[PDB]
Design an enzyme around this catalytic site. Structure first.
Site, PDB file in Angstrom:
ATOM      1  N   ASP A 180      54.697 -61.255  84.787  1.00 42.63           N
ATOM      2  CA  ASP A 180      55.830 -61.603  85.641  1.00 42.63           C
ATOM      3  C   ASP A 180      56.077 -63.108  85.619  1.00 42.63           C
ATOM      4  O   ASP A 180      57.223 -63.547  85.628  1.00 42.63           O
ATOM      5  CB  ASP A 180      55.599 -61.138  87.083  1.00 42.63           C
ATOM      6  CG  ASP A 180      56.219 -59.773  87.360  1.00 42.63           C
ATOM      7  OD1 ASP A 180      56.253 -59.346  88.536  1.00 42.63           O
ATOM      8  OD2 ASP A 180      56.677 -59.126  86.397  1.00 42.63           O
ATOM      9  N   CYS A 214      65.720 -59.749  76.536  1.00 47.85           N
ATOM     10  CA  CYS A 214      64.768 -59.821  77.639  1.00 47.85           C
ATOM     11  C   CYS A 214      65.733 -59.830  78.823  1.00 47.85           C
ATOM     12  O   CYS A 214      66.504 -58.877  78.978  1.00 47.85           O
ATOM     13  CB  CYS A 214      63.884 -61.086  77.580  1.00 47.85           C
ATOM     14  SG  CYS A 214      64.641 -62.649  77.027  1.00 47.85           S
ATOM     15  N   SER A 215      65.722 -60.865  79.652  1.00 50.03           N
ATOM     16  CA  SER A 215      66.678 -60.895  80.754  1.00 50.03           C
ATOM     17  C   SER A 215      67.900 -61.711  80.336  1.00 50.03           C
ATOM     18  O   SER A 215      69.024 -61.200  80.339  1.00 50.03           O
ATOM     19  CB  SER A 215      66.077 -61.497  82.022  1.00 50.03           C
ATOM     20  OG  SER A 215      66.966 -61.249  83.110  1.00 50.03           O
ATOM     21  N   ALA A 216      67.678 -62.976  79.977  1.00 50.80           N
ATOM     22  CA  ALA A 216      68.768 -63.852  79.537  1.00 50.80           C
ATOM     23  C   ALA A 216      68.918 -63.799  78.017  1.00 50.80           C
ATOM     24  O   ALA A 216      69.946 -64.200  77.464  1.00 50.80           O
ATOM     25  CB  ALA A 216      68.503 -65.293  79.983  1.00 50.80           C
ATOM     26  N   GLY A 217      67.887 -63.304  77.342  1.00 51.74           N
ATOM     27  CA  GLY A 217      67.939 -63.215  75.895  1.00 51.74           C
ATOM     28  C   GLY A 217      67.815 -64.560  75.199  1.00 51.74           C
ATOM     29  O   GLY A 217      68.466 -64.789  74.174  1.00 51.74           O
ATOM     30  N   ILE A 218      66.978 -65.448  75.735  1.00 52.57           N
ATOM     31  CA  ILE A 218      66.782 -66.764  75.123  1.00 52.57           C
ATOM     32  C   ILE A 218      65.333 -67.242  75.152  1.00 52.57           C
ATOM     33  O   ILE A 218      64.878 -67.900  74.216  1.00 52.57           O
ATOM     34  CB  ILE A 218      67.638 -67.855  75.814  1.00 52.57           C
ATOM     35  CG1 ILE A 218      67.197 -68.007  77.275  1.00 52.57           C
ATOM     36  CG2 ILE A 218      69.107 -67.491  75.731  1.00 52.57           C
ATOM     37  CD1 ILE A 218      67.940 -69.076  78.057  1.00 52.57           C
ATOM     38  N   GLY A 219      64.613 -66.927  76.229  1.00 54.92           N
ATOM     39  CA  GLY A 219      63.228 -67.362  76.348  1.00 54.92           C
ATOM     40  C   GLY A 219      62.232 -66.526  75.566  1.00 54.92           C
ATOM     41  O   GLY A 219      61.747 -66.944  74.509  1.00 54.92           O
ATOM     42  N   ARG A 220      61.913 -65.343  76.091  1.00 51.73           N
ATOM     43  CA  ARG A 220      60.977 -64.443  75.424  1.00 51.73           C
ATOM     44  C   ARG A 220      61.542 -64.011  74.083  1.00 51.73           C
ATOM     45  O   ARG A 220      60.821 -63.959  73.097  1.00 51.73           O
ATOM     46  CB  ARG A 220      60.699 -63.215  76.290  1.00 51.73           C
ATOM     47  CG  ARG A 220      60.158 -63.586  77.665  1.00 51.73           C
ATOM     48  CD  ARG A 220      59.859 -62.365  78.501  1.00 51.73           C
ATOM     49  NE  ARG A 220      59.729 -62.692  79.920  1.00 51.73           N
ATOM     50  CZ  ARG A 220      59.590 -61.780  80.877  1.00 51.73           C
ATOM     51  NH1 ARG A 220      59.567 -60.492  80.564  1.00 51.73           N
ATOM     52  NH2 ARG A 220      59.470 -62.149  82.147  1.00 51.73           N
ATOM     53  N   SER A 221      62.832 -63.684  74.063  1.00 53.10           N
ATOM     54  CA  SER A 221      63.509 -63.277  72.837  1.00 53.10           C
ATOM     55  C   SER A 221      63.440 -64.395  71.786  1.00 53.10           C
ATOM     56  O   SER A 221      63.389 -64.122  70.587  1.00 53.10           O
ATOM     57  CB  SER A 221      64.976 -62.952  73.126  1.00 53.10           C
ATOM     58  OG  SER A 221      65.108 -61.804  73.948  1.00 53.10           O
ATOM     59  N   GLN A 261      62.581 -71.400  76.772  1.00 49.67           N
ATOM     60  CA  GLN A 261      62.946 -72.062  78.020  1.00 49.67           C
ATOM     61  C   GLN A 261      61.928 -72.948  78.720  1.00 49.67           C
ATOM     62  O   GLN A 261      62.279 -73.640  79.676  1.00 49.67           O
ATOM     63  CB  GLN A 261      63.453 -71.014  79.006  1.00 49.67           C
ATOM     64  CG  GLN A 261      64.915 -70.673  78.812  1.00 49.67           C
ATOM     65  CD  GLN A 261      65.803 -71.865  79.103  1.00 49.67           C
ATOM     66  OE1 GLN A 261      65.927 -72.292  80.255  1.00 49.67           O
ATOM     67  NE2 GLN A 261      66.412 -72.422  78.060  1.00 49.67           N
TER      68      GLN A 261
HETATM   69  C1  LIG Z   1      70.094 -72.340  78.868  1.00 51.98           C
HETATM   70  C2  LIG Z   1      70.406 -72.313  80.368  1.00 51.98           C
HETATM   71  C3  LIG Z   1      69.140 -72.304  81.225  1.00 51.98           C
HETATM   72  C4  LIG Z   1      69.350 -72.984  82.588  1.00 51.98           C
HETATM   73  C5  LIG Z   1      68.459 -72.382  83.683  1.00 51.98           C
HETATM   74  N1  LIG Z   1      68.924 -71.030  84.016  1.00 51.98           N
HETATM   75  C6  LIG Z   1      68.071 -70.034  84.358  1.00 51.98           C
HETATM   76  O1  LIG Z   1      66.850 -70.152  84.418  1.00 51.98           O
HETATM   77  C7  LIG Z   1      68.774 -68.681  84.660  1.00 51.98           C
HETATM   78  C8  LIG Z   1      68.857 -67.767  83.390  1.00 51.98           C
HETATM   79  C9  LIG Z   1      67.515 -67.465  82.765  1.00 51.98           C
HETATM   80  C10 LIG Z   1      67.111 -68.167  81.607  1.00 51.98           C
HETATM   81  C11 LIG Z   1      65.865 -67.918  81.028  1.00 51.98           C
HETATM   82  C12 LIG Z   1      64.959 -66.952  81.578  1.00 51.98           C
HETATM   83  N2  LIG Z   1      63.726 -66.788  80.913  1.00 51.98           N
HETATM   84  C13 LIG Z   1      63.691 -65.996  79.741  1.00 51.98           C
HETATM   85  O2  LIG Z   1      62.741 -66.046  78.949  1.00 51.98           O
HETATM   86  C14 LIG Z   1      64.855 -65.008  79.400  1.00 51.98           C
HETATM   87  O3  LIG Z   1      65.077 -64.039  80.064  1.00 51.98           O
HETATM   88  O4  LIG Z   1      65.631 -65.310  78.329  1.00 51.98           O
HETATM   89  C15 LIG Z   1      62.545 -67.464  81.423  1.00 51.98           C
HETATM   90  C16 LIG Z   1      62.660 -68.880  81.738  1.00 51.98           C
HETATM   91  C17 LIG Z   1      61.591 -69.646  82.239  1.00 51.98           C
HETATM   92  C18 LIG Z   1      60.340 -69.047  82.453  1.00 51.98           C
HETATM   93  C19 LIG Z   1      60.163 -67.679  82.168  1.00 51.98           C
HETATM   94  C20 LIG Z   1      61.219 -66.863  81.658  1.00 51.98           C
HETATM   95  C21 LIG Z   1      60.849 -65.434  81.413  1.00 51.98           C
HETATM   96  O5  LIG Z   1      61.534 -64.480  81.734  1.00 51.98           O
HETATM   97  O6  LIG Z   1      59.815 -65.202  80.836  1.00 51.98           O
HETATM   98  C22 LIG Z   1      65.362 -66.215  82.756  1.00 51.98           C
HETATM   99  C23 LIG Z   1      64.481 -65.161  83.399  1.00 51.98           C
HETATM  100  C24 LIG Z   1      63.817 -65.561  84.718  1.00 51.98           C
HETATM  101  C25 LIG Z   1      63.161 -64.314  85.353  1.00 51.98           C
HETATM  102  N3  LIG Z   1      62.174 -63.755  84.631  1.00 51.98           N
HETATM  103  O7  LIG Z   1      63.526 -63.885  86.433  1.00 51.98           O
HETATM  104  C26 LIG Z   1      66.640 -66.495  83.326  1.00 51.98           C
HETATM  105  N4  LIG Z   1      70.122 -68.890  85.177  1.00 51.98           N
HETATM  106  S1  LIG Z   1      70.349 -69.067  86.899  1.00 51.98           S
HETATM  107  C27 LIG Z   1      72.014 -68.612  87.303  1.00 51.98           C
HETATM  108  O8  LIG Z   1      70.114 -70.455  87.131  1.00 51.98           O
HETATM  109  O9  LIG Z   1      69.439 -68.116  87.475  1.00 51.98           O
END
Ligand SMILES: CCCCCNC(=O)[C@H](Cc1ccc(N(C(=O)C(=O)O)c2ccccc2C(=O)O)c(/C=C/C(N)=O)c1)NS(C)(=O)=O
Length: 282
Positions: A180, A214-221, A261
């Site tokens: 998590d 994944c959720s945003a499709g940028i970090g884990r992906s 991320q």
């Molecule tokens: C490029 C723009 C980024 C600017 C910041 N934005 C965000 O973090 C988010 C989008 C955002 C971006 C990256 C995230 N993330 C990921 O690996 C993913 O899901 O791609 C993760 C990110 C950090 C740590 C762990 C995760 C994860 O899911 O493993 C997550 C997932 C968080 C979670 N697990 O609940 C969310 N936007 S908002 C409206 O501010 O909420």
């Protein structure tokens, strides 16, 4: 040697500094389509959008928008479609994309619920006798079989284009043990998962690009595609030590923003590649 470099960053604990350099150097392109008011409900996060030049287009004259990007790795000859976890209203778009792009596999790196909240819609059927039908894109989805393992689950799905009655087998690779918070202790299971996807042929040129989310499709992906390409390049070049992960990431970031991320995810990517090389090397 990236392992030697790895230990240096650890020694001087400068992961955040390095991750920040990458962030600063990262490409930046327009995302005008993603920002159109009409597409507001097609985006999960306001700050995560696909660049206009590399976005996947749905084959429909109505609204061709979906938050997905085509990451084309020229030298490694690998392509990946990175997208967000589908929304309640975009599951039909999601499968429409899988169909139009002729993808063979879908890679999921999160769970429908994490930290007590929904991070992805239940976009696939959980029981064989309960198939799903996406009326908006006229697609039918059926769970054919499932294989639950300790660190991941592989599902065999049948996708049918109701318009043409055509059908295709889609493999759903679901990594179910990503924590998590933070990143995995060791890249071992993650790497095994990666090889399982490879072994299925879903990452091969005879099929459309694999769909990763994944959720945003940028970090884990991002971690997934980065590790895969780096390993492939070390296998292709006569001088594997020339493969620079930071360089590969910047190149990938030209196609979708924010891949990787956190400094933790960056470090983890290094681990995965280093550990994966010690095995894939032979
Ligand atoms: C490029 C723009 C980024 C600017 C910041 N934005 C965000 O973090 C988010 C989008 C955002 C971006 C990256 C995230 N993330 C990921 O690996 C993913 O899901 O791609 C993760 C990110 C950090 C740590 C762990 C995760 C994860 O899911 O493993 C997550 C997932 C968080 C979670 N697990 O609940 C969310 N936007 S908002 C409206 O501010 O909420």
């Amino acid at each position: 040697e990236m392992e030697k470099e790895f230990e240096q960053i650890d020694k001087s604990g400068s992961w955040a500094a390095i991750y920040q350099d990458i962030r600063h150097e990262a490409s930046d392109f327009p995302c005008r389509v993603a920002k159109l008011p009409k597409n507001k409900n097609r985006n999960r996060y306001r700050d995560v959008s696909p660049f206009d030049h590399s976005r996947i287009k749905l084959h429909q004259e109505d609204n061709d928008y979906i938050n997905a990007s085509l990451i084309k790795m020229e030298e490694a000859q690998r392509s990946y479609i990175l997208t967000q976890g589908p929304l309640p209203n975009t599951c039909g778009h999601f499968w429409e994309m899988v169909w139009e792009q002729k993808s063979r596999g879908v890679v999921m790196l999160n769970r429908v619920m994490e930290k007590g909240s929904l991070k992805c819609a239940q976009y696939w059927p959980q029981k064989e006798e309960k198939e799903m039908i996406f009326e908006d894109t006229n697609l039918k989805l059926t769970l054919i079989s499932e294989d639950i393992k300790s660190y991941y689950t592989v599902r065999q799905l049948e996708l049918e284009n109701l318009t043409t009655q055509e059908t295709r087998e889609i493999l759903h690779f679901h990594y179910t043990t990503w924590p998590d918070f933070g990143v995995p202790e060791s890249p071992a299971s993650f790497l095994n998962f990666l090889f399982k996807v490879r072994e299925s042929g879903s990452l091969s040129p005879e099929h459309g690009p694999v769909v990763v989310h994944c959720s945003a499709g940028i970090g884990r992906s991002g971690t997934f595609c980065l590790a895969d390409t780096c390993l492939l390049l070390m296998d292709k070049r006569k001088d594997p030590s020339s493969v620079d992960i930071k360089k590969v990431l910047l190149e990938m970031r030209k196609f979708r923003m924010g891949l990787i991320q956190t400094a933790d995810q960056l470090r983890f990517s290094y681990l995965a590649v280093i550990e994966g090389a010690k095995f894939i090397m032979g």
